[PDB]
Amino acid sequence: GMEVLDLVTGPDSVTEIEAFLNPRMGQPPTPESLTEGGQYYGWSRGINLATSDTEDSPGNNTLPTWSMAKLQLPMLNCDTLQMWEAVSVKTEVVGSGSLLDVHGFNKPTDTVNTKGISTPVEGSQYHVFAVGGEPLDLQGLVTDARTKYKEEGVVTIKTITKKDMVNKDQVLNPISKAKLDKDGMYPVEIWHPDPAKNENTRYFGNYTGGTTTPPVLQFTNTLTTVLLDENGVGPLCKGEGLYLSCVDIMGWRVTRNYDVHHWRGLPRYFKITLRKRWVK
Amino acid sequence: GMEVLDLVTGPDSVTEIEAFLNPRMGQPPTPESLTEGGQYYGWSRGINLATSDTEDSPGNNTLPTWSMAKLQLPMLNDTLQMWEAVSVKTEVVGSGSLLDVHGFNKPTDTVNTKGISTPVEGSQYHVFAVGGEPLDLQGLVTDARTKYKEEGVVTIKTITKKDMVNKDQVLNPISKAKLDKDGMYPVEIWHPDPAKNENTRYFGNYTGGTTTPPVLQFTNTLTTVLLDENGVGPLCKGEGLYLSCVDIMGWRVTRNYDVHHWRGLPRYFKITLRKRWVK
Amino acid sequence: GMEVLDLVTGPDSVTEIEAFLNPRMGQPPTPESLTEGGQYYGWSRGINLATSDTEDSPGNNTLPTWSMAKLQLPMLNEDLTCDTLQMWEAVSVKTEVVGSGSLLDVHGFNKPTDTVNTKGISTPVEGSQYHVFAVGGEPLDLQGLVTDARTKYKEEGVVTIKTITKKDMVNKDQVLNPISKAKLDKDGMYPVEIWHPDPAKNENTRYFGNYTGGTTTPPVLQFTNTLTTVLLDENGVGPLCKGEGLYLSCVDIMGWRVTRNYDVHHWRGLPRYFKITLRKRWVK
Amino acid sequence: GMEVLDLVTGPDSVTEIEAFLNPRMGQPPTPESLTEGGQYYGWSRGINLATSDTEDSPGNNTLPTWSMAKLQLPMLNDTLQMWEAVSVKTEVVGSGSLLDVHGFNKPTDTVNTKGISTPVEGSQYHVFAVGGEPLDLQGLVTDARTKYKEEGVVTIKTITKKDMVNKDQVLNPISKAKLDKDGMYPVEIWHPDPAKNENTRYFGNYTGGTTTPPVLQFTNTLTTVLLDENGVGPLCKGEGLYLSCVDIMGWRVTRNYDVHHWRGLPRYFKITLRKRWVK
Amino acid sequence: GMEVLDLVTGPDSVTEIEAFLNPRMGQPPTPESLTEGGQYYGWSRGINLATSDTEDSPGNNTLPTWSMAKLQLPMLNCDTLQMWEAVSVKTEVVGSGSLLDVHGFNKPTDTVNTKGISTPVEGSQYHVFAVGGEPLDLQGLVTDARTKYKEEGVVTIKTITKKDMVNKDQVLNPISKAKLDKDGMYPVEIWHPDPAKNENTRYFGNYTGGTTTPPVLQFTNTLTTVLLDENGVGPLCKGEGLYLSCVDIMGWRVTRNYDVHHWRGLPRYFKITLRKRWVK
Ligand SMILES: CC(=O)N[C@H]1[C@H](O[C@@H]2[C@H](O)[C@@H](O)[C@H](O)O[C@@H]2CO)O[C@H](CO)[C@H](O)[C@@H]1O[C@@H]1O[C@H](CO)[C@H](O)[C@H](O[C@]2(C(=O)O)C[C@H](O)[C@@H](NC(C)=O)[C@H]([C@H](O)[C@@H](CO)O[C@]3(C(=O)O)C[C@H](O)[C@@H](NC(C)=O)[C@H]([C@H](O)[C@H](O)CO)O3)O2)[C@H]1O
Ligand SMILES: CC(=O)N[C@H]1[C@H](O[C@@H]2[C@H](O)[C@@H](O)[C@H](O)O[C@@H]2CO)O[C@H](CO)[C@H](O)[C@@H]1O[C@@H]1O[C@H](CO)[C@H](O)[C@H](O[C@]2(C(=O)O)C[C@H](O)[C@@H](NC(C)=O)[C@H]([C@H](O)[C@@H](CO)O[C@]3(C(=O)O)C[C@H](O)[C@@H](NC(C)=O)[C@H]([C@H](O)[C@H](O)CO)O3)O2)[C@H]1O
Ligand SMILES: CC(=O)N[C@H]1[C@H](O[C@@H]2[C@H](O)[C@@H](O)[C@H](O)O[C@@H]2CO)O[C@H](CO)[C@H](O)[C@@H]1O[C@@H]1O[C@H](CO)[C@H](O)[C@H](O[C@]2(C(=O)O)C[C@H](O)[C@@H](NC(C)=O)[C@H]([C@H](O)[C@@H](CO)O[C@]3(C(=O)O)C[C@H](O)[C@@H](NC(C)=O)[C@H]([C@H](O)[C@H](O)CO)O3)O2)[C@H]1O
Ligand SMILES: CC(=O)N[C@H]1[C@H](O[C@@H]2[C@H](O)[C@@H](O)[C@H](O)O[C@@H]2CO)O[C@H](CO)[C@H](O)[C@@H]1O[C@@H]1O[C@H](CO)[C@H](O)[C@H](O[C@]2(C(=O)O)C[C@H](O)[C@@H](NC(C)=O)[C@H]([C@H](O)[C@@H](CO)O[C@]3(C(=O)O)C[C@H](O)[C@@H](NC(C)=O)[C@H]([C@H](O)[C@H](O)CO)O3)O2)[C@H]1O
Ligand SMILES: CC(=O)N[C@H]1[C@H](O[C@@H]2[C@H](O)[C@@H](O)[C@H](O)O[C@@H]2CO)O[C@H](CO)[C@H](O)[C@@H]1O[C@@H]1O[C@H](CO)[C@H](O)[C@H](O[C@]2(C(=O)O)C[C@H](O)[C@@H](NC(C)=O)[C@H]([C@H](O)[C@@H](CO)O[C@]3(C(=O)O)C[C@H](O)[C@@H](NC(C)=O)[C@H]([C@H](O)[C@H](O)CO)O3)O2)[C@H]1O
């Protein structure tokens, strides 16, 4: 599919597919038990801090990771073949209204009397989505190349290189690249969309920092994101696979015990419109 | 009405309907008495907090719920006609009332008990929808362990007849409902379902925090087009038009242990509809 | 005059008129004396607080009210029995809130920023802000809605819900009660914490409003002589001036200053300029 | 030159002129000495406060004033020609200098005298104007009782020859002036007059507060068109072009009694002009 | 040539080049050792403060400087010649997700119990990029003309003028000009894009101040910045050299030792589209 030709016409030349991607904040979907850890699903476990300038060992279940799904498209296939082309996406982050629960057991707004309301989710927020015809290309970049990430259960820079991180990993080191090929495995504090690749994926991201920052979110079923490039060509789905990637961090809740923070994430809906494209 | 055809022309082919939806913050419209609870109408009652990690039992009158109304349209009927909602002018009314800083709220100077009465601040939530059938709802909660009352509110357990599961803290497609009753569906549980709502347009925003300044714009000059990408608006099944909304401005805080009360404001809708031939 | 026809052409068929509306924050324009109360003009008097959950009696001079003016345009119709008549149509307005630069005075005697030493700067105006303007061919239609139906507004000196209904406020007045309606027919009388533009009426008026809350919120304002607000509706028709009367309405609250005595707050308002372009329209 | 006719064509019919206007925050450009006061150039001197409700006497060197320049254009003259200002590229230069947090300002850790030197913060005011005559000014003050110096600043009393009146705290049409001198008209007194300025375009914004983060954008790719609704730009009377501005970024705060100094930045103008036939 | 004619057509008449510029916050890329100073790469060293109103001498490694690169373009070139013209650029700041590391050893959010989270990067932010056919023209302007900048290892106003700064250097002094001709050498608190020059460069900048201000950033591979002027002419590359300039400061991290601040910068990606232009 090097040369892109005419749009395919006729019955079933256009298709629409939908999916939701649940957040991957740290606690896995199982155990389902609401006493055995399932109560943290949708959240991270309590963020654990470095014990010195040289001893930073975050728990896997404290690190939000990328969500991803590979969706199978209808079968297609002569020198001239057909590919599915992603034209547009309607995407929405669902559940912001749930943050209006200020009646729980979080750190209260009046700490003097332990009264007021249960402090709502606040702070650093991170929203990225991508739609592509192959896995999202990732570029590694970390706060601290000395961070001692677990070897098992997360894919980190050392997983790829088979070597410890180097100081260049705190800036742009082109050696430290990966592909988003697994859900709930690639930490978002390590792996970023690679602007030097991703020719066949469109991604859109934003970051707002701070500690008590009010979370902001909009949602509507009326907004379409066009995925066509400058030449009018959308992502082309290699082997009829469509890749969806996202992360939607709303901030942290804070407990009444030593200000322990838990990340909060929300699920993202995708509705992708695709059309068949003649290719050579 | 599966196939959408031409616009109907001629006498009475276009109509306009207006409505206001009052907020449903927790205190019901009655009793009307300003000593017996009526003084809280437009507000929630005092937000009560969980007593432990496993004991979260919010009062029904502390939980803002969706406002909704079903409006009856003029009677109509191989080829039939349906009312098509083309546009809406909608406005949230009464933000100027938040300029009352002369009441008995927590004062701005708590050291001396002086200053002004702290105005409404904090988390804000504005959603409206216009559709030809009830708004489709998707459940999602902060805490699947929350012990909502069984009577007086429609919650996930009302629908499933079973306790919430951990998946209800993310997207669980089992936990769905329709917004078919005013003042019954808590907004901390029920969200517009993006997987459905083919015949409704909804528009929402959330701003969080505790002391966040509330922001609101209002004008009679703004029109929201309801037509989809094919130029087709919501089609009104059985000549019923559904309006849905919630408009939370934040909380007021009292001088007694910082008790918070939600504040909501009413929303005006003016919908323009036209007759559409369907087959 | 309800069927709207062609635009009138010829000498004097288009006019521009200008006006400024001074703010009505609580202190009246008189007395002019800078010792006898005039020093508060442009501001409210010190905001007084409720003494209990059931005793909220704000002073009239602590309540900002709507500014309004009715401008009389040149008479058009010698004979109102003519089949086709003319009306003035408001096409557009250039409007501006003047004097935000004055808020850069941080050398006065407000609560200072260094409270240990009574030093630093005089705290500038901050907090809740409210900006609304309207241009119409009849009075702005108002809808009442209050924080507290129990608020004991004075009977004399302000037009409130009770002024209209002749009865005490009801709990529904804390939400939308369609009984509680009025028209903005007098300057400096209708409190902005009570009376809001009525979206169910105002067919012949355009209004534009915004609110930003909080207590120490930085005030924000833009001003330029290059911005035109179009007043034409979706059908290309502006407000039509009934009996050649043009109605201007506004409120422009910038926040409060805070004194050195028990954190007493005074509302600050600024004046608004209007330059309205009008044209003659044939009607029947 | 009342009636505006065709654009003039031919050699030298279009010209571009550039200028920078330095801020006028209170310390004059001289003395240049970095020990005898010149170290405050680009800043005000320390803001001095009223001593009572009736004694507010600010120092001239504590009051930011309008910057202005009159630029002479190329010589021109029934049908005459005038220079017409078509557009302007304008930019506030030096925001990067606010990234100096290594100085001796009030530190972020006042307990230990550690952290960083607090950067410039607070109230911000940006206005620029381009016209064919002086910017028309309308006076309006916080306090008509303020005792401005008679010499060294142009204030309302300078114009009227009488003390300010209470109406000067709102809009008093008597209190008008023209911006005809650089570094003389305080910005807390004198505002662009929207009832005049038919031959000037002005653009302003204000953001208040005490610790507000300053915000600024800059690019050489943005052009401000100066043409009115009829396609006519400011027409330069007697071939004079007037530039006016003020660009306040906030205050720095010292380690002694929180003394505040205003910070201003310079503004660049590149104006495109064309000759216009007039009669 | 200074007269701009038609666009060149035919084989290889258009080219695309890409580059990343790593931030220059104060610590140089070497030593690479994560114990010998390399751990600060991507950051400044600890900001040192003035000791009096007349003694302000910042360490060079505490001052963020401009990043720049000169890229060589394909060789060109009787009377009419050709030049490379920069048409557009896609540019992105990479790695904001790394600021979601709140598990380190920064000053904690709960200083009573030394708990909560590791305070994320916050405060003053500064983002500028430029693309041009010659070095970015710089105009000097400082907070304090008395600042004792080091004479070695950095280019300051005194480097250029061979004289001490004067009071006019705190406003616009037209004598105090330079060109951005070296990477990691021109402090951003001294040197600003010069709006009186730069006829052959486009620059775009923003500043947000404060001390605890939440950092904000957007990133996408779908945004193109057009570099053509009002006449449809992009920067023309003198001697086939393309100049890229930037700085991307995200704020500071604060340590647990006397609130020491370290600047944080992030790398910027550029993808520039160029076309050949006939000139006379
Ligand atoms: C329990 C513990 O100390 N775990 C730490 C672990 O210890 C190992 C082992 O588990 C121990 O048995 C043994 O003594 O020691 C070994 C190690 O030598 O070691 C880990 C590193 O190797 C971690 O340090 C781990 O500590 C946990 O670390 C995570 C991050 O990775 C979190 O920081 C976690 O903090 C939380 C959490 O779980 O997220 C924060 C949260 O806010 C707390 N919730 C509340 C309401 O306070 C919980 C809470 O303290 C947990 C501790 O596990 O207690 C409960 C719970 O409420 O979740 C108590 C429940 O009664 C229990 N349920 C039942 C049916 O018994 C429940 C359940 O065990 C777990 O949820 C299962 O995962 O735990 O802590 C931090 O504790
Ligand atoms: C009164 C009470 O204790 N109610 C709680 C209820 O108790 C039950 C019963 O009412 C008691 O008599 C008996 O002893 O116990 C049973 C049950 O064991 O139990 C409920 C759960 O089943 C709740 O716990 C309930 O407490 C109330 O809960 C709601 C949330 O659901 C609120 O948190 C409420 O707090 C407020 C409120 O009403 O919203 C907060 C508000 O800020 C307070 N207002 C002020 C000005 O302080 C009020 C206030 O404390 C109420 C308490 O009811 O007192 C007034 C009032 O001001 O509203 C006092 C008036 O004098 C009274 N009017 C008259 C004519 O007597 C008025 C009126 O009764 C009610 O408004 C009618 O609903 O109440 O509390 C929290 O109290
Ligand atoms: C003075 C007083 O107590 N007034 C209250 C009023 O009392 C009535 C009557 O005036 C009294 O003589 C008598 O003893 O009692 C009767 C009835 O009880 O009763 C009212 C209710 O019926 C009010 O409670 C009123 O209090 C005033 O209420 C208003 C709101 O409606 C304000 O809150 C006001 O507070 C301010 C104000 O005037 O806005 C706040 C302001 O920040 C203060 N200014 C300063 C610099 O501190 C002023 C100030 O304290 C006033 C109080 O009147 O004193 C001055 C002034 O500075 O304005 C002092 C001047 O010397 C004086 N001028 C001359 C020439 O003598 C000047 C002048 O009288 C008034 O400005 C004219 O209106 O007053 O208070 C709050 O006081
Ligand atoms: C010094 C003084 O008291 N000045 C006030 C003046 O007093 C007059 C006279 O100077 C006295 O000797 C005599 O006793 O009284 C007469 C008349 O009363 O009276 C004025 C009113 O008429 C003012 O009140 C004046 O006070 C000054 O007012 C301005 C506002 O108009 C400022 O608020 C100023 O405060 C600053 C300032 O200069 O901006 C604030 C600044 O943050 C301070 N800087 C530092 C580093 O602390 C300075 C500083 O305190 C000044 C005071 O003048 O000291 C230096 C300086 O650092 O600038 C010290 C230097 O050593 C000196 N240079 C040399 C070579 O000796 C330098 C220099 O004199 C001046 O800059 C020249 O203008 O002053 O204060 C406030 O002081
Ligand atoms: C160490 C010192 O005092 N340096 C100052 C310097 O002293 C001179 C000379 O270099 C010294 O060796 C000798 O003892 O004394 C002379 C004369 O006094 O003089 C300079 C002026 O010319 C400076 O004042 C210099 O101070 C340093 O200045 C920079 C800014 O220019 C910074 O402010 C720096 O502070 C930091 C920093 O390095 O950025 C702040 C940071 O937050 C701190 N980090 C931590 C985790 O606390 C570090 C830290 O204190 C450094 C001090 O050098 O210690 C380590 C480190 O953690 O980085 C400790 C490590 O064990 C060590 N590595 C090894 C293998 O031993 C490591 C390494 O030496 C350096 O990083 C290499 O550059 O240093 O300070 C401020 O100290």
mmCIF file of C-alpha atoms in Angstrom, chain D residues 17 68-73 84-85 130-133 226 234 236-243 271 273:
data_model
loop_
_atom_site.group_PDB
_atom_site.id
_atom_site.type_symbol
_atom_site.label_atom_id
_atom_site.label_comp_id
_atom_site.label_asym_id
_atom_site.label_seq_id
_atom_site.Cartn_x
_atom_site.Cartn_y
_atom_site.Cartn_z
ATOM 1 C CA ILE D 17 8.394 52.935 9.821
ATOM 2 C CA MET D 68 4.142 58.085 23.576
ATOM 3 C CA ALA D 69 6.020 59.198 20.501
ATOM 4 C CA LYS D 70 5.142 61.434 17.593
ATOM 5 C CA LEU D 71 6.884 60.291 14.413
ATOM 6 C CA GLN D 72 7.348 62.633 11.457
ATOM 7 C CA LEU D 73 6.441 61.115 8.104
ATOM 8 C CA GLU D 84 -2.815 56.484 6.008
ATOM 9 C CA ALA D 85 -1.767 53.903 8.619
ATOM 10 C CA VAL D 130 -1.727 54.025 16.615
ATOM 11 C CA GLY D 131 -3.327 57.223 15.316
ATOM 12 C CA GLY D 132 -3.064 60.350 13.167
ATOM 13 C CA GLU D 133 -3.370 62.674 16.187
ATOM 14 C CA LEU D 226 -5.841 49.412 11.371
ATOM 15 C CA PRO D 234 -5.867 56.520 10.697
ATOM 16 C CA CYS D 236 -1.940 61.467 9.677
ATOM 17 C CA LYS D 237 -2.612 65.153 10.241
ATOM 18 C CA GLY D 238 0.419 67.302 9.376
ATOM 19 C CA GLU D 239 2.294 64.073 8.517
ATOM 20 C CA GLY D 240 2.505 63.158 12.206
ATOM 21 C CA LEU D 241 2.066 59.556 13.381
ATOM 22 C CA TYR D 242 1.225 58.982 17.061
ATOM 23 C CA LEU D 243 2.220 55.827 18.949
ATOM 24 C CA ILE D 271 3.694 50.529 10.933
ATOM 25 C CA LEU D 273 1.505 53.406 5.682
#
